[PDB]
Amino acid sequence: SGAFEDRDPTQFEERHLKFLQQLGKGNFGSVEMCRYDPLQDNTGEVVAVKKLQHSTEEHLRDFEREIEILKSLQHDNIVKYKGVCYSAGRRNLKLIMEYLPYGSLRDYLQKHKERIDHIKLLQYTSQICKGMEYLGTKRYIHRDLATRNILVENENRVKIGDFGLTKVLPQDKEYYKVKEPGESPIFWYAPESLTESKFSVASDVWSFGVVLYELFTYIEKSKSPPAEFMRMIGNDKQGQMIVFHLIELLKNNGRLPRPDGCPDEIYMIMTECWNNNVNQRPSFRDLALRVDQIRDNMAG
Ligand SMILES: O=C(Nc1ccnc(NC(=O)C2CC2)c1)c1c(Cl)cccc1Cl
């Protein structure tokens, strides 16, 4: 036996990370739930563990970029970084984060309407803006805002996750142009992201507007942004034809419809976010203030 000195809590011992459950398998990654049990006493902290399907030089570099980004964020409405695990004898790499019991907001809205009203939706809306205000201070562009990439800790708290697509803005530039292979979340995309692959805080604001739309549809069967845009576009269209028509439609003021039961003031917030003019979209700080004020202005 040997001596031991742990001056790095962000390094998790593969041997002590215990499988509990399989949570998700996306496009490049998958997530499990584990217990970290250094004391071998069958009790430890519960954590979410993300791993790569294929550690290509490119995939790995992205993953490491993603981990640095998460590690650099400390905020109540951003998923907590916990550390990493160099499993397979330190020849593989896994991300250790907080586990959020209720999973994505999208599922939560869907599976727990009994628990959700407009006061909740506003609380969640507010927290997302604040998490987003925080990314801004790091000059991070998330690029993938949607209720599926927001997670529910409990009834009273949601957190932004999914930082795999996040870009850093150089000091002297206000957009990031990213030329990327494969599929895009096109129905969440600002027009300039669609037409020019330009991403910015403003394009995040656009996407946020769509997030706001999703919340007030309560993720109802026919009302998702893809289902609604596809109705407007023609449900039979395929391939690029969908993109062509989406772009043309957005460019000429075609917009998601006000969800049933949704207050005009809230729909108006969506529409301001959905401004073709990039510089005329409100900021996240504008958004959080307006949303908290709407919340505060109620009798209760
Ligand atoms: O990171 C994710 N999901 C998490 C993270 C932490 N905790 C949870 N908690 C749960 O899934 C609970 C419901 C079982 C989910 C995730 C996945 Cl797997 C796919 C796409 C986008 C995202 Cl952000």
Swiss-Prot record:
Domain Protein kinase: 17-292
Residues annotated with Phosphotyrosine modification: Y36, Y134, Y140, Y175, Y176
Major location (coarse): membrane
Organ and tissue specificity: Ubiquitously expressed throughout most tissues.
Swiss-Prot/TrEMBL GO biological process terms: actin filament polymerization; activation of Janus kinase activity; adaptive immune response; apoptotic process; axon regeneration; cell adhesion; cell differentiation; cell surface receptor signaling pathway via JAK-STAT
Record keyword Metal-binding present: yes
Post-translational modification: Autophosphorylated, leading to regulate its activity. Autophosphorylation on Tyr-36, Tyr-134 and Tyr-140 in response to growth hormone (GH) are required for maximal kinase activity. Also phosphorylated by TEC. Phosphorylated on tyrosine residues in response to interferon gamma signaling. Phosphorylated on tyrosine residues in response to a signaling cascade that is activated by increased cellular retinol. Undergoes Notch-induced ubiquitination and subsequent proteasomal degradation which is mediated by ASB1 or ASB2, the substrate-recognition components of probable ECS E3 ubiquitin-protein ligase complexes.
MF annotations from Gene Ontology: acetylcholine receptor binding; ATP binding; growth hormone receptor binding; heme binding; histone binding; histone H3Y41 kinase activity; identical protein binding; insulin receptor substrate binding
Location in the cell: Endomembrane system; Cytoplasm; Nucleus
Family named by the database record: Belongs to the protein kinase superfamily. Tyr protein kinase family. JAK subfamily.
Free-text note regarding domains: Possesses 2 protein kinase domains. The second one probably contains the catalytic domain, while the presence of slight differences suggest a different role for protein kinase 1.
Noted disease: Chromosomal aberrations involving JAK2 are found in both chronic and acute forms of eosinophilic, lymphoblastic and myeloid leukemia. Translocation t(8;9)(p22;p24) with PCM1 links the protein kinase domain of JAK2 to the major portion of PCM1. Translocation t(9;12)(p24;p13) with ETV6.
General function of this protein: Non-receptor tyrosine kinase involved in various processes such as cell growth, development, differentiation or histone modifications. Mediates essential signaling events in both innate and adaptive immunity. In the cytoplasm, plays a pivotal role in signal transduction via its association with type I receptors such as growth hormone (GHR), prolactin (PRLR), leptin (LEPR), erythropoietin (EPOR), thrombopoietin receptor (MPL/TPOR); or type II receptors including IFN-alpha, IFN-beta, IFN-gamma and multiple interleukins.
Protein's UniProt name: Tyrosine-protein kinase JAK2
Organism per entry: Homo sapiens
Part of the intact protein present: 833 to 1132 of 1132
